Enzyme design. Structure first.
Site, mmCIF file in Angstrom:
data_model
loop_
_atom_site.group_PDB
_atom_site.id
_atom_site.type_symbol
_atom_site.label_atom_id
_atom_site.label_comp_id
_atom_site.label_asym_id
_atom_site.label_seq_id
_atom_site.Cartn_x
_atom_site.Cartn_y
_atom_site.Cartn_z
ATOM 1 C CB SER A 63 -1.012 0.031 1.148
ATOM 2 O OG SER A 63 -1.987 -0.994 1.013
ATOM 3 C CE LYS A 66 -3.906 1.461 -0.958
ATOM 4 N NZ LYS A 66 -4.648 1.094 0.246
ATOM 5 C CE1 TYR A 149 -5.800 0.382 2.736
ATOM 6 C CE2 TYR A 149 -5.262 2.296 4.089
ATOM 7 C CZ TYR A 149 -4.889 1.335 3.158
ATOM 8 O OH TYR A 149 -3.608 1.274 2.663
ATOM 9 C CD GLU A 271 -3.466 6.514 6.754
ATOM 10 O OE1 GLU A 271 -3.319 6.181 7.950
ATOM 11 O OE2 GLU A 271 -3.843 5.712 5.874
ATOM 12 C CE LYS A 314 -1.143 3.714 2.780
ATOM 13 N NZ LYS A 314 -1.680 2.705 3.706
ATOM 14 C CB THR A 315 1.653 0.436 7.271
ATOM 15 O OG1 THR A 315 0.239 0.467 7.008
ATOM 16 C CG2 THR A 315 1.870 1.209 8.536
ATOM 17 N N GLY A 316 2.638 -0.627 4.436
ATOM 18 C CA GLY A 316 2.242 -1.351 3.246
ATOM 19 C C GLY A 316 2.605 -2.806 3.418
ATOM 20 C CB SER A 317 1.442 -5.788 4.221
ATOM 21 O OG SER A 317 1.638 -5.006 5.369
HETATM 22 C C1 LIG Z 1 -1.823 -1.956 1.893
HETATM 23 O O1 LIG Z 1 -0.687 -2.301 2.198
HETATM 24 C C2 LIG Z 1 -2.821 -3.006 1.899
HETATM 25 C C3 LIG Z 1 -3.891 -2.899 1.043
HETATM 26 C C4 LIG Z 1 -5.354 -2.955 1.504
HETATM 27 C C5 LIG Z 1 -2.630 -4.297 2.745
HETATM 28 N N1 LIG Z 1 -3.972 -4.960 2.610
HETATM 29 C C6 LIG Z 1 -3.935 -5.851 3.549
HETATM 30 C C7 LIG Z 1 -4.634 -7.179 3.449
HETATM 31 O O2 LIG Z 1 -4.120 -8.248 3.777
HETATM 32 O O3 LIG Z 1 -5.789 -7.199 2.974
HETATM 33 C C8 LIG Z 1 -3.379 -5.352 4.564
HETATM 34 C C9 LIG Z 1 -3.554 -5.678 5.971
HETATM 35 O O4 LIG Z 1 -2.422 -5.801 6.826
HETATM 36 C C10 LIG Z 1 -3.043 -6.857 7.412
HETATM 37 C C11 LIG Z 1 -4.622 -4.706 6.520
HETATM 38 C C12 LIG Z 1 -4.354 -3.198 6.204
HETATM 39 C C13 LIG Z 1 -4.044 -3.017 4.706
HETATM 40 C C14 LIG Z 1 -3.012 -4.049 4.282
#
Ligand SMILES: *C(=O)/C(=C/C)[C@@H]1NC(C(=O)O)=C2[C@@H](OC)CCC[C@@H]21
Length: 359
Positions: A63, A66, A149, A271, A314-317
């Site tokens: 993320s 973004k 979100y 953010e 901002k965190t992203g995964s």
């Molecule tokens: C942004 O990094 C992101 C997009 C929505 C990642 N989505 C997920 C997910 O697994 O659906 C995660 C989660 O981390 C658990 C929840 C927040 C957003 C992020």
């Protein structure tokens, strides 16, 4: 002040325990301090091959992509191509559903349209099906009242925002944000030749990388190394140093305050929270139970321009990567933590806070 020697100890003593506790194979960190980025690399990018993480290793931003989406949008606004107050429909005349009537580009950009879901359904594989999807979406809330979100929200803002330029999203991004900022190793699609730099993600012992999906470049498909990411953070922290007039403005617009949700403020991608802020407040909004909950908003109208005394982050995964970035313009310090393991967000912000607090 803080010595380079001391900074290296702070980073090592914070990062080494984290990797071990969270079982993260590799990590690349950049700490911005005193006008310069400082790099620290740890572990492996690919276990099977025994390849070490280096300042050239490519990590999936998830993320954090973004933030690029927001800046690209801000830049289009500064060029006069798009306005956040415009109805979504101005950019998609085919979206004829009357439920879109009072929904603005701002709402798409800030997850405030009224309940757009977390993800674009997997069944959505093309343009016509994307239309079917938004056309049949029934909003749970009126526009501008609830933040939920969603990649389906900001992802559409990204696609629509580049329409007036006449360029496909990837080319708009490369031409107007990446190239001018010299982010030459930042990719939506990684070329064949750059692949050897691409680390493997690790979930629960399985090597993984991000899969394709509709609007992925707009919401979670960007890959970079810690060098480009440090220079990206430096552009966003000190845009006075950005020569391109509209790109300078777009950066400002993305760090502007549009909505207040509890103790945080929603920008375009980014953010923010007011600085000084204590670790417990940032860490508590890090949680998934919270990050993903639909919450009411207090509108900031007109939006407030960037405030220097802010913690912007901002965190992203993705399935196999966990990244985080945070900076405080007032203090001209910032940090980038790239990782090939999606470990708990609260752990990410705790470490970032601890090392920034040392500066
Ligand atoms: C942004 O990094 C992101 C997009 C929505 C990642 N989505 C997920 C997910 O697994 O659906 C995660 C989660 O981390 C658990 C929840 C927040 C957003 C992020």
């Amino acid at each position: 002040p803080v010595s380079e020697k001391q900074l290296a100890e702070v980073v090592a003593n914070t990062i080494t325990p984290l990797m071990k506790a969270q079982s993260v194979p590799g990590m690349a960190v950049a700490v911005i301090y005193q006008g310069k980025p400082h790099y620290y690399t740890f572990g492996k990018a690919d276990i099977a091959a025994n390849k070490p993480v280096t300042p050239q290793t490519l990590f999936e931003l998830g993320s954090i992509s973004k933030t690029f989406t927001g800046v690209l949008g801000g830049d289009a606004i500064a060029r006069g191509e798009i306005s956040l107050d415009d109805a979504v429909t101005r950019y998609w005349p085919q979206l004829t559903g009357k439920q879109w009537q009072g929904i603005r580009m701002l709402d798409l950009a800030t997850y405030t349209a009224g309940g757009l879901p977390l993800q674009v359904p997997d069944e959505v594989t093309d343009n016509a099906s994307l239309l079917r999807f938004y056309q049949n979406w029934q909003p749970q809330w009126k526009p501008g009242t609830t933040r939920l979100y969603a990649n389906a929200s900001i992802g559409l803002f990204g696609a629509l925002a580049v329409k007036p330029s006449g360029m496909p999203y990837e080319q708009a991004m490369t031409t107007r944000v990446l190239k001018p900022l010299k982010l030459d190793h930042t990719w939506i699609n990684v070329p064949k030749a750059e692949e050897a730099h691409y680390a493997w993600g690790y979930r629960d012992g399985k090597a993984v990388r991000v899969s394709p999906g509709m609007l992925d470049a707009q919401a979670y498909g960007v890959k970079t190394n810690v060098q480009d990411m440090a220079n990206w953070v430096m552009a966003n922290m000190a845009p006075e140093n950005v020569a391109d007039a509209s790109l300078k403005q777009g950066i400002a617009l993305a760090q502007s305050r549009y909505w207040r949700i509890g103790s945080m403020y929603q920008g375009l991608g980014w953010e923010m929270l007011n600085w000084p802020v204590e670790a417990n407040t940032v860490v508590e909004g890090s949680d998934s139970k919270v990050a993903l909950a639909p919450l009411p908003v207090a509108e900031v109208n007109p939006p407030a321009p960037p405030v220097k005394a802010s913690w912007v982050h901002k965190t992203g995964s993705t399935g196999g990567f966990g990244s985080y970035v945070a900076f405080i313009p007032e203090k001209q310090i910032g940090i980038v933590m790239l990782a090939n393991t999606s470990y708990p967000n609260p752990a990410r912000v705790e470490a970032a806070y601890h090392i920034l607090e040392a500066l």
